[PDB]
Design a protein around this nucleic acid. Structure first.
Ligand SMILES: [Cl-]
Ligand SMILES: [Cl-]
Ligand SMILES: [Cl-]
Ligand SMILES: [Cl-]
Ligand SMILES: [Mn+2]
Ligand SMILES: [Mn+2]
Ligand SMILES: [Mn+2]
Ligand SMILES: [Mn+2]
Ligand SMILES: [Mn+2]
Ligand SMILES: [Mn+2]
Ligand SMILES: [Mn+2]
Ligand SMILES: [Mn+2]
Lengths: 78, 97, 92, 104, 96, 108, 84, 99
DNA sequence: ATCAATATCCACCTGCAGATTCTACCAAAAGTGTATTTGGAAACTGCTCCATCAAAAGGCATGTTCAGCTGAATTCAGCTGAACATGCCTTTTGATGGAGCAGTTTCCAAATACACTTTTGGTAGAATCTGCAGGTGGATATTGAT
DNA sequence: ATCAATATCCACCTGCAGATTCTACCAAAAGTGTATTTGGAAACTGCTCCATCAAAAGGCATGTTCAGCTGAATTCAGCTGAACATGCCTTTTGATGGAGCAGTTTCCAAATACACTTTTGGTAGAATCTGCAGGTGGATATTGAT
């Protein structure tokens, strides 16, 4: 599934980041980082889900997860 | 047969994407990865659509920000090309490692 | 149920830009903003009072919390507004 | 005759009070605290809406969208410092290209 | 006219003898140990407090503490902390 | 009235269950605090100070000392992956740092 | 009392070298010493500013170790060892 | 001879030495003097518990040391062994102390 | 810098749909009017601690020499990563239903908060104990020159 | 491949600044007998959430070409490390005065608690509108070529 995050899409992110030239190994490196990021955030969110005894991860769960990870996000209930 | 020199179109893409705000990762593939990772912590979960969107917004802002630091690290090494080495340095200084 | 600062953000929007509107998403951003700063001021005032073994959060804790949290000019003006509203509130 | 009108504010003093009490911050809450806190929140909100409104106007838009809130925050040294650990969904980033990457 | 200030020194010292009967601790080290306990206490309580608030709950139970501990501690540290906590509670309730 | 049993002894703990329960009620964490909460928290706190004292005592041993000092606490924290992450934003006064020289810097 | 001036120079070249040594640095360019002083001063101002703000709020004239400890916690530089 | 250690040898001796110890590296009085000067520029007539000055020195030194490690990685990354203001600035920017 | 030929941008308009803004109404807050509780300010003042001073000593900060070897420039070419025309399929997206499920109610037995009344567990010093900081000295490297 | 020159270790020693214990209250747990909630436990809804289905369309995966970037190899001016001579000023030790925390009381202005009375903000349809997404048509910016 993570290979689903494609080279060109990673190129795009790098572009919005101001990157001009990209090494061929960046794509796999980026996927690894992206995965650790999602695991960390989702783990916390699901923990808020489970605590609330729900079967549905809510935007709020993610928002609270992001806040704990020092990644505060505006736009989804805080 | 017209052809742009290497770097010319790249610079053009930077200007385009730094101008917009649309998510840059295709939605379905991303949603698929989110659910796969989540499945390892708790089975048979459902997701509010906005939950998936928050994660993608958070994820892409993080990656874009991370690429900026990586870029700064590459330039610091007299390069114009980013490498795993640059991503690694940035994450180390950020304390993510 | 489900209350938000929308009504209020919008009113304030009209005073500074009577001509300008605001999208739903942008309104969502403003709500997040207000909730966040509210939590930060409140939390700090909470600590200030606890550090000083006080059981009540007065405008004095809110002010110091503001000085501790907002950068320079933002802090000056916020403080100015804060004491201004308390002054007016106590007079009449 | 509400406390807000008395305080001369648009933001809800009565609600800020209920939120301070129900938020487990302290055992008691002074009467001025909600007024002060409410005024601070309204002011910062006016600051962002002002600058964000300007960003819209300078884009030939009349409706403020996330992009505008991001441009206002990031182009303001103070607002940026205050929200440096916050991400505005759908706001993108400021256009900026490292000199060394330009042509010729 | 004394002004007494509490501490965890007595308890830190007991746990020390349990793990290293032969070992002592300087006051500076005990100072560090005290800051540590107070710090993790605040982090756990803080997280428990938030958790309860997000769930419209007015009371913090062993369950909030448990989920707070899982959120705060990394891998193995969490698993073991949860076991000790759970154990202590069931013991405590079993009147044990 | 029956003879008093401390909640700690009931919980089978060294850490003060009563103290922790009081600290919880007076810390403005919630309107009310459950009876198990202070027990569960005292246990986790006791377990964590047991884990770091174990590793610190060992560092003391390695440095041939019988008394744990700040430096021992540091060596134990920074050398343990999990404690290091948990206290990754913490500074131990008089702890110094782990001896560590980047390879590129050694005599070529 | 007596005018306090230029005390930043009290942070000597050898003291900065020692600090870089503990930080694992083998070689140091001549301009490092002035950069370091500037960074130290910014760091110190911000912590002292917050510490003194906690001092003033308590209506005290004496900045306490706790004032500094709270200032550091705010700045995300938690310090163990002075919580007394 | 006279005997002379090659440049770099003593520097490495110093790294090992200071990474072994935990004593504060900046002289006490001078540092207390700096704290008093900065404080005074913020609020006159302030007093300090000796303990408060030490908490600050412990924190400033832990901070500088950590910053130098980061600076050192930025230099090595530039294929250098000599830290420069450039590296400190890169480290601080990535640390988010001054993007 | 021009000459020329691609492709890129870039204003100006323009037409609708997706949102916004505007209305029309009800419970859940918010504002009152009283009646008490109480937190913590004001008034001493006991007394830790902080600011200063004196003074002698040697650990270190300063400066200066000198030259090792590191950073800064150059040059060069092998080959990685950009730009692209191609061909194809995974992402979009739009209903259509069915359903797993957040959200609400209504009780209530279990669990907490209370207000007192005893009972120790802790904390603040004295009274005892003792690692180990500092000093010395050969055994052991560790370096750097022939 | 040696050895001087020094730096680095490790073990042996010994009183004392810094732990460990020993004592004594007393602040704050613990034991009890009531007075509230509280958070479930079932029972049922209106929904947002998966599932397919089913097309089409960009958007992605490929294979080519080669521009130009990264790295390796060489130089070399001079920055910065190692050593030394000098002697300044941080450290140490103690002694005081008294500023200003901290401990205690005394006690109102101010906050908590109801019991109601009004009022406003959250909802769910209804009446506009701001841009998005195209459409030209016109200078621009690029890159090949004199
Ligand atoms: Cl690499
Ligand atoms: Cl108040
Ligand atoms: Cl419980
Ligand atoms: Cl530089
Ligand atoms: Mn053991
Ligand atoms: Mn009272
Ligand atoms: Mn070199
Ligand atoms: Mn070529
Ligand atoms: Mn006893
Ligand atoms: Mn020794
Ligand atoms: Mn209304
Ligand atoms: Mn358009």
């Amino acid at each position: 599934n993570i290979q689903g995050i494609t080279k060109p899409a990673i190129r795009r992110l790098a572009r919005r980041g101001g990157v001009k030239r990209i090494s061929g190994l960046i794509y796999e490196e980026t996927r690894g980082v992206l995965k650790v990021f999602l695991e960390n955030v989702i783990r916390d969110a699901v923990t808020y889900t489970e605590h609330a005894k729900r079967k549905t991860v809510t935007a709020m769960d993610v928002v609270y997860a992001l806040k704990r990870q020092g990644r505060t996000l505006y736009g989804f209930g805080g | 047969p017209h052809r742009y020199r290497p770097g010319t179109v790249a610079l053009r893409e930077i200007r385009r994407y730094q101008k917009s705000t649309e998510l840059l990762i295709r939605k379905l593939p991303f949603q698929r990865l989110v659910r796969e990772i989540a499945q390892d912590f708790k089975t048979d979960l459902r997701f509010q659509s906005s939950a998936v969107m928050a994660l993608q917004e958070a994820c892409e802002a993080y990656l874009v920000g991370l690429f900026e630091d990586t870029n700064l690290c590459a330039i610091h090494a007299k390069r114009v090309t980013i490498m795993p080495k640059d991503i690694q340095l940035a994450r180390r200084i950020r304390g993510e490692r | 149920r489900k209350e938000s600062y929308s009504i209020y953000v919008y009113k304030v929007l009209k005073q500074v830009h009577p001509d300008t509107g605001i999208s739903s998403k942008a309104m969502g951003i403003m709500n997040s903003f207000v909730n966040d700063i509210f939590e930060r001021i409140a939390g700090e005032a909470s600590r200030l009072a606890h550090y000083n073994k006080r059981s009540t959060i007065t405008s004095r804790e809110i002010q110091t919390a503001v000085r501790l949290l907002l950068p320079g000019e933002l802090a000056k003006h916020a403080v100015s507004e804060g004491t201004k509203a308390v002054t007016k509130y106590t007079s009449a | 005759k509400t406390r807000s009108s008395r305080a001369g504010l648009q933001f809800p003093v009565g609600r800020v009070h209920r939120l301070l009490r129900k938020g487990n911050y302290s055992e008691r809450v002074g009467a001025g605290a909600p007024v002060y806190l409410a005024a601070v929140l309204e002011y910062l909100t006016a600051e962002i809406l002002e600058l964000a409104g300007n960003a819209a106007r300078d884009n030939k838009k009349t409706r403020i969208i996330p992009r505008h809130l991001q441009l206002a925050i990031r182009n303001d040294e103070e607002l940026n410092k205050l929200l440096g650990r916050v991400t505005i969904a759908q706001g993108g980033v400021l256009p900026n290209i490292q000199a060394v990457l330009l042509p010729k």
